[PDB]
Design a binder for this molecule. Structure first.
Ligand SMILES: [Sm+3]
Length: 460
């Protein structure tokens, strides 16, 4: 994706947005007791630890844009991937303003904590005013739908979160390019069954993990990926998606039977409202559109299928098994294919594909080394057929040392226990013991290890 043009909001007569220009992240009491580097992201041009122009930094992610019509290999991959997806028998029927608004079984009511987006953000009017959860009202939406229409621009906040020392100074703090409520209900109303299917079918058929409890799903990935092993992750996946991949994503939904795949063009080329200065981009996935997670996965399934055909000759795609959660990949084939080969090959579609999280360089992948959703795979001692998701203790330490509002310093610490304990009894007791060094640490009521193991076992 490349930025084709920049204008001022004045030119379009649009009220600018005062982007939250201060981090709400402060150091928690566990800042001294645990180790970590990561500090909060840069949200302002002045921010003293910044060694670079922020304007340029925030948008450097848009490296360029490769222009082709879909390759022959590309085209095979969409017919094969779409093929698998037909077997699921996904309804092509569209959803209702009421369904799309407040969920069905499969979907979850649009979050009334996220931004409504343009133009609502600049009218002070937020999600609650339109959305009555108890009533399940459709008058306020239908009104503001008829009024402002669809295909509205995107409000581009800059995301407030922990970043590594490098991504702090180099101004890499990434963006959420948030969608208008109009647009998110619109295509949530006609690809609602596409999302429904992916949420109910996390696996090797959808090539998807989006919406899955790793607690249980971890202990089933190894049954599904029965073959050799590869894993990947990209740097700036979203921004790097040249339009071609979108023309494939559409082509897939078209074969699936969704009139509405036209929407996909509407996310490829988009307008973004950053501070005032409104950008317009060709390509790139909006990080925080409606089906971002799902569309990425689908495209990733298109991409590795393509790269592997590009790279190799005599290959049956039916035995190629894939599992993507956005940029995160796991893939398996009966024969040992070379990750490195693939990564290079994809670099001529504009992609920077890379070894999975916590991996220095492409070696043969093994269940001992693998990462997915930032977690290791550690099979249980007593019952080796059950598999633990092990979020590394560094990542958990790095999270506990900061806090937004130290009232929910419990809710946050408890949540970290549900992840920590998978590391094993020895480490979990060291963890809560160190937490309980601090004075507010001891007042927190924490689950004991045997409690957490039992809750986990009961899930089966
Ligand atoms: Sm990733």
């Amino acid at each position: 994706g490349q930025v084709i043009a920049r204008h001022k909001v004045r030119e379009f007569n649009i009220n600018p947005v005062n982007t939250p220009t201060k981090s709400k992240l402060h150091p928690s009491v566990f800042y001294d007791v645990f180790p970590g580097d990561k500090e909060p992201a840069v949200l302002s041009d002045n921010d003293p630890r910044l060694e670079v122009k922020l304007t340029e930094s925030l948008f450097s992610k848009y490296k360029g844009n490769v222009n082709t019509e879909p390759t022959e290999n590309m085209l095979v991959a969409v017919d094969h991937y779409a093929g698998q997806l037909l077997s699921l028998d996904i309804p092509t029927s569209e959803l209702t303003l009421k369904e799309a608004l407040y969920g069905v079984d499969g979907l979850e009511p649009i979050d009334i904590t996220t931004s409504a987006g343009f133009p609502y953000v600049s009218l002070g009017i937020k999600k609650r005013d339109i959305l009555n959860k108890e009533t399940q009202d459709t008058e306020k939406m239908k009104f503001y739908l008829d009024k402002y229409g669809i295909d509205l621009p995107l409000v581009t906040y800059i995301k407030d979160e922990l970043r590594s020392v490098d991504k702090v100074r180099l101004g890499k703090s990434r963006l959420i390019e948030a969608s208008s409520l109009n647009d998110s209900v619109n295509m949530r109303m006609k690809l609602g069954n596409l999302y429904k299917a992916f949420h109910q079918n996390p696996g090797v058929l959808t090539g998807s993990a989006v919406g899955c409890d790793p607690d249980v799903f971890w202990s089933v990935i190894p049954c599904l990926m029965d073959g050799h092993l590869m894993a990947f992750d990209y740097s700036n996946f979203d921004a790097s998606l040249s339009p071609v991949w979108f023309v494939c994503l559409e082509k897939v939904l078209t074969k699936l039977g969704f009139a509405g795949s036209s929407l996909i063009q509407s996310i490829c080329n988009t307008h973004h409202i950053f501070r005032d200065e409104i950008y317009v981009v060709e390509g790139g996935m909006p990080s925080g559109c409606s089906g971002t997670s799902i569309f990425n996965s689908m495209i990733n399934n298109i991409i590795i299928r393509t790269l592997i055909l590009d790279a190799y000759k005599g290959i049956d795609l039916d035995k190629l098994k894939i599992l993507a959660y956005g940029d995160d990949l796991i893939v398996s084939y009966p024969y040992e294919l070379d990750p490195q080969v693939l990564a290079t090959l994809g670099k001529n579609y504009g992609l920077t594909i890379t070894p999975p999280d916590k991996s220095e360089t492409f070696t043969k992948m093994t269940w001992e080394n693998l990462t997915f959703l930032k977690r290791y795979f550690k099979p249980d001692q007593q019952f080796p057929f059950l598999v633990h998701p092990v979020m590394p203790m560094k990542d958990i330490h790095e999270s506990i040392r900061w806090t937004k509002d130290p009232k929910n310093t419990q809710d946050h610490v408890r949540s970290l226990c549900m992840l920590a304990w998978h590391s094993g009894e020895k480490e979990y007791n060291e963890f809560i013991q160190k937490i309980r060094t601090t004075d507010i640490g001891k007042c927190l009521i924490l689950p004991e290890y045997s409690v957490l193991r039992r809750r986990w076992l009961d899930l089966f």
